[PDB]
Amino acid sequence: HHMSTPQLMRVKKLSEFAILPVRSSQFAAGFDLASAYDYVVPARGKCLVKTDLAVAVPHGYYGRVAPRSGLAVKNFIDVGAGVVDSDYRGNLGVLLFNHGDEDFKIARGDRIAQFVIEQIALPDIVEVDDLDETERGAGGFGST
Ligand SMILES: O=c1ccn([C@H]2C[C@H](O)[C@@H](CO)O2)c(=O)[nH]1
Ligand SMILES: [Mg+2]
Ligand SMILES: [Mg+2]
Numbered sequence: 001h002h003m004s005t006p007q008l009m010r011v012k013k014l015s016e017f018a019i020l021p022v023r024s025s026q027f028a029a030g031f032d033l034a035s036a037y038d039y040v041v042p043a044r045g046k047c048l049v050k051t052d053l054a055v056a057v058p059h060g061y062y063g064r065v066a067p068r069s070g071l072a073v074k075n076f077i078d079v080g081a082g083v084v085d086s087d088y089r090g091n092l093g094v095l096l097f098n099h100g101d102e103d104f105k106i107a108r109g110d111r112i113a114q115f116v117i118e119q120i121a122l123p124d125i126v127e128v129d130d131l132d133e134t135e136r137g138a139g140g141f142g143s144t
Contacts (some may be wrong), residue, residue: 030114
């Protein structure tokens with residue numbers, strides 16, 4: 001019965017190591033996500049980081065795991081995967097890619113990504129015989 005809304009999102013800690021998501025500025029797009037454990041993201045490699053949080057993203061939205069800009073510029077860290085469905089009730093994981101040539105060390109509590117509650121539509125699909133014509137048309141992949 002009790003469901004998240006755009007104004008109030010429900011979060012459950014799955015262990016004593018989880019840190020609640022928190023926005024770092026007044027109008028920050030995302031909630032900072034902290035690692036629940038120590039990890040090493042190998043050079044040119046990847047690592048799935050557990051937050052030990054379960055989140056109920058409000059219906060009409062999804063949660064996008066997104067990169068922190070400092071770790072991207074300084075450490076060549078990117079976020080893979082990243083689509084968290086509003087019906088997902090498992091452990092929120094952050095998939096990190098390390099494109100650099102040095103390992104990237106993560107300690108428990110380090111903020112290693114952010115979580116953006118992005119508004120979406122979930123339309124029904126109708127197969128049609130023709131689509132409306134536009135100026136763009138089939139122009140894609142570097143037309144403009
Ligand atoms: O970065 C990601 C991508 C996916 N998932 C989970 C939630 C999502 O609903 C499910 C299937 O993509 O896996 C995560 O925890 N993190
Ligand atoms: Mg990308
Ligand atoms: Mg899927």
